[PDB]
Amino acid sequence: SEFMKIAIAGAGAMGSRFGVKLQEAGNQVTLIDNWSAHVDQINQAGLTVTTDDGVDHVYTMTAQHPEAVTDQFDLIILFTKTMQMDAMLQQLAPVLTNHPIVLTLGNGIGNIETIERHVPKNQIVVGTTVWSSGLTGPGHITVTGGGSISLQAVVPDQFPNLADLITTLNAAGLNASAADNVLAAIWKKAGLNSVLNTYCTLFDCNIGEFGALKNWQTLTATVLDEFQAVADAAQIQFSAAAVTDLIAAQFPAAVNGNHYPSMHQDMANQRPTEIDFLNGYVAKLGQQLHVPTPANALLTQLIHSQEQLKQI
Amino acid sequence: SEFMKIAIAGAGAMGSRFGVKLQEAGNQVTLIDNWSAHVDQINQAGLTVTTDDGVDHVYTMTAQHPEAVTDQFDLIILFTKTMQMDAMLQQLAPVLTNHPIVLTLGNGIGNIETIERHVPKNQIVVGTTVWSSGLTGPGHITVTGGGSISLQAVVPDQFPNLADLITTLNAAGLNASAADNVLAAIWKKAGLNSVLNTYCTLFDCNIGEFGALKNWQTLTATVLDEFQAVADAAQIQFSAAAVTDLIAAQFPAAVNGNHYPSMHQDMANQRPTEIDFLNGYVAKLGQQLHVPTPANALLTQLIHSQEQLKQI
């Protein structure tokens, strides 16, 4: 009875990892991705999962490109980064006629709003996860330690079978728990990213160097006070002070002192950044809620400008 | 009777040029500067002024380092960039006991406020100029065409002898006119500089490249709407639209399309920038006048951060 038919939209490190534990627990899983070498590697030689011990576990899996799915699922777990999401849901439009559960486990505050345009919002379940996974290559991921999951329906009153959903996951050893605090934690992670990704990209510095700035506190506060004012308007729990501590914890060289965050790399390699889904998204919501967000609106403009200059 | 005893605090291209025409018209002029090679060059071999024709006019002049002046003047003409001004007025503190006319012809909206702390504000006369001058080297400047001057006492009611002042200058062929619109024009120039210097430095681009940005209008508007709101509060004439046109006029390669403005160069050569006296100054005034300036406050922070990263 804990059987569900399950799709993984975003068969990356995490999606691939979740796909396997859910399959090995008897569920019928399809992995969906656009990366040709990945999808093809799995259909021809199985997904490989290098465990604690450097031991290669070849697992037989079903993979497909999004446009090439006509099957329907009881549950779709989205791992699509917010930016690719609209495209990924566009391309899956047919499969959602049955109105399945949409379980977004990606990062990004823009996800619910983005998802609302493709399905009924009563089907949406946001989640966070500390399960980890590395993507070593096509049809190849590396795993260590354990983890858990925390879930929260967007509209708790209209949502059926959160218990069954949790049972299904926990049956695959995933440690799912119902919680009322998931959207808060998504906002927390996006507060951190909207400071460290954005400023590091703007300054062409790494996280330690940002940390060493005489004015990092004011730069941080400026972004976060606006998040706070918007979180409050949207009635989501948020503490600027807490996020600031999380931000500070990254500075040491033992942690991320010498790391250039994902946005900096995107800029360096002339990839569009997720800025519209970080500071860009807080500004947009701000305006919907009549909360002024001039600093996040501006930083968003500065990054787009940077993009345009790199492409030359 | 149009004779005055005159000091030039800021004996650069313009100060040196004004020093000469005022001397040749019978006034007793002292040139004041910190650049050793300059001051020494003039005391030993005269100031050279290469005219339209590539003809070298050697002129005998008096030059001194600021700390080494005990003379007193009827008029002091400041050409000191706002940033050096406080130091330059600190070092001249003794000479102002007589309460002379202070004629600031430098650029910068921060000048009056800065000057007010050193002399009575009834002695202050702000000015603009289209006289041009190149600084070729120590005791060496190059001149072409002509020009004029426009003056405006800070407090028009308490100021004596604006007519005599103008007579003194015009006696040296300088074309001084009384005007009520000088502080406005200083603000105009500072609106342009606070967009083009600041953003070019932040983007490591030249003026044409800024001009080619999809969002240059919004970036510009963001800075200028705040200037506008502050100019209004301070009851100074200002048009964001007009400054925008002046800004647009720079983009073409025939004009400044391939120029990196002074702030970009300062950053490149690890010189402190004038940011606190551009966007920094509009923000500070904004707060005095209860006009919100979050964008200019922020850009000011971003540039300081940039400075600190370059010095490493």
| Test mutation, B194, B305, B306, chain A, max A CBs within 10 A | B305
Minimal Cβ distance to B219: which of A215, A219, A301:
A301
- Residues A221 and A293 sit within 8 Å (Cβ to Cβ): no
Minimal Cβ distance to B213: which of A213, A295, A305:
A305
- Residues B98 and B72 sit within 8 Å (Cβ to Cβ): yes
Q: Report domain B182-311's class.
A: mainly alpha
> How far are the Cα atoms of A51, B43, B133, B257 from residue B254, in angstroms, in the given order?
64, 40, 20, 7
CB proximity A294 to B under 8 Å: yes
By three-state DSSP, how is residue B174 classified? coil
Which H or E element spans position A36?
helix A36-45
CB proximity A222 to B under 8 Å: yes
Q: Is B52 exposed, middle or buried (0-12, 13-18, 19+ CB in 10 A)?
A: exposed
Residues of A in contact with B194 (CB under 8 A): none
Q: Do A215 and B305 touch (CB under 8 A)?
A: yes
Structure-determination technique: X-ray
Nearest in space to A10 (alpha carbons), one of A82, A95, A109: A82
- Residues B140 and B134 sit within 8 Å (Cβ to Cβ): no
Residues of A in contact with B309 (CB under 8 A): 203-205, 209, 213
Minimal Cβ distance to A202: which of B218, B295, B302:
B302
Which CATH number among 3.40.50.970, 3.40.50.720, 3.90.1720.10, 3.90.1010.10 corresponds to the domain B5-178?
3.40.50.720
Sequence-distant (≥ 6) Cβ neighbours of residue B197 within 8 angstroms = B261, B262, B263, B264, B273, B274, B278
Q: Do A214 and B304 touch (CB under 8 A)?
A: yes
Query: Which ranges of B145-215 would DSSP assign to H, the alpha helix?
Result: 162-171, 182-203, 207-211
Block residue for tokens 């490989």: A48
Q: What does the alpha-carbon distance between residue A45 and residue A57 come to, in Å, rounded to a whole number?
A: 12
Strand runs (DSSP E) across chain A, as ranges?
5-9, 28-32, 47-50, 56-59, 62-64, 75-78, 101-104, 124-129, 134-137, 140-142, 149-153, 176-178
Minimal Cβ distance to B309: which of A205, A222, A299:
A205
Q: Is A159 exposed, middle or buried (0-12, 13-18, 19+ CB in 10 A)?
A: middle
Nearest in space to B115 (alpha carbons), one of B105, B98, B102, B131: B102
Q: What does the alpha-carbon distance between residue A238 and residue A230 come to, in Å, rounded to a whole number?
A: 9
Supply A71's token pair.
């099957």
Nearest in space to A298 (alpha carbons), one of A240, A233, A222: A222
- Residues A19 and A181 sit within 8 Å (Cβ to Cβ): no
Q: Do B222 and A295 touch (CB under 8 A)?
A: no
Nearest in space to B179 (alpha carbons), one of B125, B254, B217, B232: B125
Which H or E element spans position A247?
helix A240-250
Residues β-bridged to residue B151: B127, B178
DSSP state of A161: -
Pairing of strands B149-153, B124-129: antiparallel
> CA B22 from chain center: how many Å?
19
Question: Looking at the annotation, which residues of B are catalytic?
Answer: 189
- Residues A273 and A201 sit within 8 Å (Cβ to Cβ): yes
Q: What does the alpha-carbon distance between residue B270 and residue B299 come to, in Å, rounded to a whole number?
A: 18
Q: Do A222 and B295 touch (CB under 8 A)?
A: no
Question: Looking at the annotation, which residues of A are catalytic?
Answer: 189
A5-178 and A182-311 have identical folds: no
Block residue for tokens 């777990």: A77
| Nearest-10 Cα torsion for A124, A126, A131, A132 | 100
Closest approach of B132 to chain A, Cα-based (Å):
34
Q: What does the alpha-carbon distance between residue A287 and residue A282 come to, in Å, rounded to a whole number?
A: 9
Supply B311's token pair.
């010095």
Resolution in A: 2.5
Q: Do A215 and B304 touch (CB under 8 A)?
A: yes
Residue spans of the domains in chain A: they are: 5-178, 182-311
